[PDB]
Design a protein around this motif. Structure first.
Motif, PDB file in Angstrom:
ATOM      1  N   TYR A  82       0.804  -1.211   0.000  1.00 34.26           N
ATOM      2  CA  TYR A  82       0.000   0.000   0.000  1.00 34.26           C
ATOM      3  C   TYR A  82       0.839   1.264   0.000  1.00 34.26           C
ATOM      4  O   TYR A  82       0.342   2.310  -0.414  1.00 34.26           O
ATOM      5  CB  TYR A  82      -0.964  -0.032   1.177  1.00 34.26           C
ATOM      6  N   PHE A  86       0.157   3.846  -2.808  1.00 40.68           N
ATOM      7  CA  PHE A  86      -0.003   5.272  -2.553  1.00 40.68           C
ATOM      8  C   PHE A  86       0.792   6.097  -3.548  1.00 40.68           C
ATOM      9  O   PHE A  86       0.297   7.104  -4.061  1.00 40.68           O
ATOM     10  CB  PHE A  86       0.427   5.622  -1.130  1.00 40.68           C
ATOM     11  N   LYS A 146      -6.884   0.442  -3.057  1.00 44.98           N
ATOM     12  CA  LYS A 146      -6.281   1.759  -2.854  1.00 44.98           C
ATOM     13  C   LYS A 146      -6.368   2.535  -4.158  1.00 44.98           C
ATOM     14  O   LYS A 146      -5.498   2.441  -5.022  1.00 44.98           O
ATOM     15  CB  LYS A 146      -4.842   1.620  -2.377  1.00 44.98           C
ATOM     16  N   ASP A 150      -6.041   9.321  -0.111  1.00 46.14           N
ATOM     17  CA  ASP A 150      -6.667   9.806   1.111  1.00 46.14           C
ATOM     18  C   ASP A 150      -5.980   9.239   2.346  1.00 46.14           C
ATOM     19  O   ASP A 150      -5.584   8.072   2.378  1.00 46.14           O
ATOM     20  CB  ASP A 150      -8.146   9.431   1.119  1.00 46.14           C
ATOM     21  N   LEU A 151      -5.844  10.080   3.375  1.00 48.79           N
ATOM     22  CA  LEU A 151      -5.203   9.694   4.624  1.00 48.79           C
ATOM     23  C   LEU A 151      -6.166   9.560   5.792  1.00 48.79           C
ATOM     24  O   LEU A 151      -5.853   8.843   6.745  1.00 48.79           O
ATOM     25  CB  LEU A 151      -4.118  10.712   5.009  1.00 48.79           C
ATOM     26  N   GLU A 152      -7.314  10.233   5.749  1.00 46.28           N
ATOM     27  CA  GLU A 152      -8.281  10.223   6.838  1.00 46.28           C
ATOM     28  C   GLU A 152      -9.451   9.291   6.559  1.00 46.28           C
ATOM     29  O   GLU A 152     -10.574   9.552   7.000  1.00 46.28           O
ATOM     30  CB  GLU A 152      -8.782  11.640   7.109  1.00 46.28           C
ATOM     31  N   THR A 154     -10.699   5.043   6.304  1.00 51.33           N
ATOM     32  CA  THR A 154     -10.430   3.637   6.577  1.00 51.33           C
ATOM     33  C   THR A 154     -11.032   2.804   5.455  1.00 51.33           C
ATOM     34  O   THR A 154     -12.233   2.900   5.181  1.00 51.33           O
ATOM     35  CB  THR A 154     -10.995   3.205   7.929  1.00 51.33           C
ATOM     36  N   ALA A 419      -3.747  -2.505  12.717  1.00 48.88           N
ATOM     37  CA  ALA A 419      -3.962  -1.116  12.323  1.00 48.88           C
ATOM     38  C   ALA A 419      -5.401  -0.877  11.886  1.00 48.88           C
ATOM     39  O   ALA A 419      -5.983   0.168  12.193  1.00 48.88           O
ATOM     40  CB  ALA A 419      -2.992  -0.734  11.210  1.00 48.88           C
ATOM     41  N   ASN A 420      -5.990  -1.833  11.168  1.00 49.25           N
ATOM     42  CA  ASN A 420      -7.361  -1.750  10.664  1.00 49.25           C
ATOM     43  C   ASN A 420      -8.133  -2.954  11.185  1.00 49.25           C
ATOM     44  O   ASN A 420      -8.113  -4.028  10.566  1.00 49.25           O
ATOM     45  CB  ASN A 420      -7.374  -1.704   9.139  1.00 49.25           C
TER      46      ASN A 420
ATOM     47  N   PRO B  43      -4.252   3.576   9.682  1.00 48.82           N
ATOM     48  CA  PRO B  43      -4.299   2.216   9.141  1.00 48.82           C
ATOM     49  C   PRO B  43      -3.291   2.045   8.017  1.00 48.82           C
ATOM     50  O   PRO B  43      -2.974   2.985   7.294  1.00 48.82           O
ATOM     51  CB  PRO B  43      -5.738   2.085   8.631  1.00 48.82           C
ATOM     52  N   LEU B  44      -2.790   0.823   7.868  1.00 52.73           N
ATOM     53  CA  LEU B  44      -1.712   0.588   6.916  1.00 52.73           C
ATOM     54  C   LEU B  44      -2.172   0.639   5.468  1.00 52.73           C
ATOM     55  O   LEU B  44      -1.331   0.553   4.571  1.00 52.73           O
ATOM     56  CB  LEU B  44      -1.050  -0.760   7.202  1.00 52.73           C
ATOM     57  N   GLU B  45      -3.477   0.760   5.219  1.00 55.82           N
ATOM     58  CA  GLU B  45      -3.980   0.785   3.850  1.00 55.82           C
ATOM     59  C   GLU B  45      -3.646   2.085   3.142  1.00 55.82           C
ATOM     60  O   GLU B  45      -3.722   2.142   1.913  1.00 55.82           O
ATOM     61  CB  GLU B  45      -5.486   0.564   3.834  1.00 55.82           C
ATOM     62  N   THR B  46      -3.327   3.137   3.883  1.00 56.04           N
ATOM     63  CA  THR B  46      -2.629   4.255   3.285  1.00 56.04           C
ATOM     64  C   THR B  46      -1.130   3.968   3.301  1.00 56.04           C
ATOM     65  O   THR B  46      -0.664   3.003   3.906  1.00 56.04           O
ATOM     66  CB  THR B  46      -2.963   5.558   4.009  1.00 56.04           C
TER      67      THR B  46
END
Lengths: 423, 49
Positions: A82, A86, A146, A150-152, A154, A419-420, B43-46
Motif C-alpha cells: 500500500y 499510494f 487503494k 486519502d489519509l483520513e 479507513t 492497524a485496521n 491504518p496501513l492501507e494508506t
C-alpha cells in the motif's frame, strides 16, 4: 497585499517536474514486495532448511500454520504494497500538474502508474483473496482497493469481482497511455507496451477468460517471441534480466534470505525428465537427500515479472482450454524444443501429440511447474487450476492440506488487522 | 489539510447597580476543539504508519 495562494515551501523536495515524478515512481518500483516467493513457500517447490534460525522464520509458512504461527515467523509485507500503491495513486492523481515534460513522457508515467496499481492489486488479491475460478468466491471480501491518496479514510475489503474489475480497468487505462516499446536494460523494470499485454494475459488466465488470455498472449507473441535456447547455452537462465526473454525485470521474486533458507525437494525434481537443460541450469548439484539449492534467484539480477516463457504457456493453456488442441500443441513443444535435448524432444513431441485435452492440460501445467520454477508461479498456479491435496513430511511429522482448503488463501497479516480492525 | 475547529458557546450576565456603584460581569463558556492537528496512528492501507 498578497498574490494567489500558489506558494511552494523551500525546505524539501516537492515533486513537480516529470523528472521528479519519475524519481518518485522509481522509488515506488524499488519497494515492490517479494511476496510471491514467500507465497510459493507454501507450495511443493520449496523446502526450508533443517536448521534453526531458519525454521522459525519460514517453517510455519511451509506447513500452512495459519492459526498458531511462531511469533518470529516471516510476515507478508502488507504495508509495502500500500506504500507503492499510494505512490502510484499520487502519480495518477497528478496528471495535469506534471510540468517540464512532453505529453508522451507524462502519458507513459501515468500509464506506468496505472499498470503498477493493477499489478499490485492483482498480486495482493491473489495473495490474500480467494481464487477467481473458485465457486462462491466472486462475492467474498478479499482486500481493500487503494484508488486514491486519502489519509483520513479507513478502507474496507472489496469482493474479488470488484478487485478484478479494477485490475482490468487499470490495464485498459495503461494500454492507452504507455507509449514506450522498449526500455534500456538497466531501466527494464519499467513497464513497456508489451507489459500491458503480458499482464492482461496473466490476469485473464487467473480469471479463466481463455479467449482474452490467448488474444493477449498472441498479441505480445507477435512482437517478442524469441526464447533462450538452452541446448545451445546450457547455463543461461531466462530469469536473468539481461535475457532476450525478459519483458519486465521488476520483481526479484526470491529474496536473499528466502533463497538461502530453502532447498528444492526431490519430489519436485522428479517432475523433470532425464534430458532437460532446466534440471542442471536452474539448480545446483544434489545433496545427501537429493535436495538442490536454486541458482535462479536470491540476487537482484534475477529479476523478472513477465517474460516470453510464461506467455508461451499462457497461450498453450488458453488454447487447450477452448478445444483448440492444434494451437496448444503448436505453442507447446515450441518451449520444450528450447528446453529439452533433441533426443528427448522427439519423445516429448510424440507424447504431446497423443493426448486429449485433459491430458494436454495436465502436461501444460507440469511444463509450467518445471519452466517457471522458483519464479513465484507455483502457489498461484496451484490455486488457479485444481487446489490439489498436498502432503508434506517435515521433521518426522506429516502435514496435509486438503483439496479446496481454506488455507489456500493466506490470511491478511497481523499488522494490517491491528492497524485496521475491520479487516 | 485545514484549520482546527473550535465550537464554542458563551453565556454572560452584565449587572450594574447604584449609579455604577457596583458592576458585575459573569461569563460561563464551553469550547470544544476538534480537528486538531497531531500525529495519528493511521491504518496501513494508506502508505504510512
Amino acid at each position: 497585499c498578497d498574490s494567489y495562494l500558489d506558494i511552494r515551501p523551500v525546505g524539501s523536495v516537492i515533486p513537480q517536474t516529470a523528472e521528479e515524478y519519475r524519481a518518485l515512481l522509481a522509488r515506488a518500483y524499488l519497494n515492490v514486495p517479494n511476496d510471491r516467493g514467500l507465497a510459493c513457500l507454501r507450495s511443493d517447490e520449496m523446502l526450508v532448511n533443517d536448521n534453526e534460525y531458519d525454521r522459525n522464520s519460514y517453517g510455519d509458512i511451509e506447513r500452512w500454520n495459519d492459526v498458531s504461527p511462531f511469533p518470529g515467523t516471516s510476515q507478508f509485507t502488507w504495508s509495502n504494497f500500500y506504500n507503492v500503491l499510494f505512490i502510484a495513486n499520487q502519480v495518477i492523481e497528478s496528471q495535469k500538474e506534471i510540468t517540464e515534460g512532453t505529453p508522451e513522457v507524462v502519458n507513459q508515467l501515468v500509464g506506468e502508474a496505472h499498470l503498477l496499481r493493477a499489478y499490485l492489486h492483482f498480486v495482493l488479491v491473489n495473495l490474500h483473496g480467494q481464487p477467481y475460478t473458485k465457486s462462491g468466491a466472486l462475492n467474498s471480501k478479499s482486500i481493500p482497493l487503494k484508488l486514491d491518496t486519502d489519509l483520513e479514510k479507513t478502507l474496507g475489503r472489496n469482493t474479488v469481482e470488484e478487485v478484478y474489475t479494477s485490475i482490468l480497468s487499470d490495464i485498459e487505462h495503461a494500454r492507452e497511455l504507455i507509449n514506450k516499446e522498449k526500455w534500456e536494460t538497466v531501466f527494464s523494470y519499467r513497464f513497456n507496451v508489451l507489459s500491458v499485454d503480458a499482464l492482461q494475459s496473466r490476469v485473464s488466465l487467473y480469471m479463466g477468460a481463455w479467449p482474452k488470455c490467448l488474444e493477449s498472449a498472441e498479441a505480445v507473441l507477435a512482437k517478442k517471441s524469441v526464447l533462450v535456447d538452452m541446448n545451445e547455452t546450457p547455463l543461461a537462465l531466462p530469469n536473468h534480466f539481461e535475457s532476450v526473454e525478459s519483458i519486465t525485470a521488476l520483481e526479484q521474486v526470491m529474496g536473499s534470505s528466502v533463497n538461502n533458507a530453502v532447498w528444492v525437494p526431490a519430489t519436485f525434481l522428479a517432475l523433470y525428465q532425464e534430458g532437460d537443460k532446466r534440471l542442471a541450469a536452474y539448480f545446483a548439484a544434489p545433496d545427501e537427500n537429493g535436495n538442490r539449492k536454486s541458482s535462479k534467484g536470491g540476487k537482484r539480477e534475477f529479476s523478472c515479472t513477465f517474460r516470453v516463457g510464461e506467455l508461451y504457456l499462457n497461450a498453450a493453456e488458453a488454447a487447450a482450454n477452448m478445444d483448440k488442441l492444434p494451437h496448444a500443441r503448436m505453442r507447446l513443444l515450441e518451449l520444450m524444443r528450447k528446453r529439452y535435448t533433441p533426443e528427448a524432444y522427439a519423445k516429448k513431441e510424440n507424447a504431446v501429440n497423443v493426448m486429449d485435452k485433459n491430458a494436454l492440460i495436465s502436461e501444460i501445467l507440469n511444463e509450467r511447474a518445471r519452466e517457471l520454477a522458483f519464479e513465484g508461479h507455483r502457489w498461484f498456479d496451484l490455486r488457479r487450476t485444481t487446489r490439489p491435496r498436498m502432503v508434506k513430511v517435515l521433521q518426522g511429522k506429516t502435514y496435509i492440506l486438503e483439496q479446496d482448503d481454506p488455507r489456500y488463501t493466506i490470511p491478511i497479516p497481523r499488522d494490517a488487522i491491528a492497524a485496521n480492525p475491520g479487516l | 489539510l485545514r484549520w482546527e475547529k473550535t465550537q464554542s458557546v458563551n453565556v454572560g450576565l452584565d449587572f450594574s447597580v447604584l449609579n455604577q456603584a457596583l458592576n458585575l460581569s459573569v461569563d460561563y463558556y464551553y469550547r470544544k476543539g476538534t480537528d486538531l492537528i497531531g500525529k495519528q496512528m493511521l491504518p496501513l492501507e494508506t502508505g504510512f504508519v
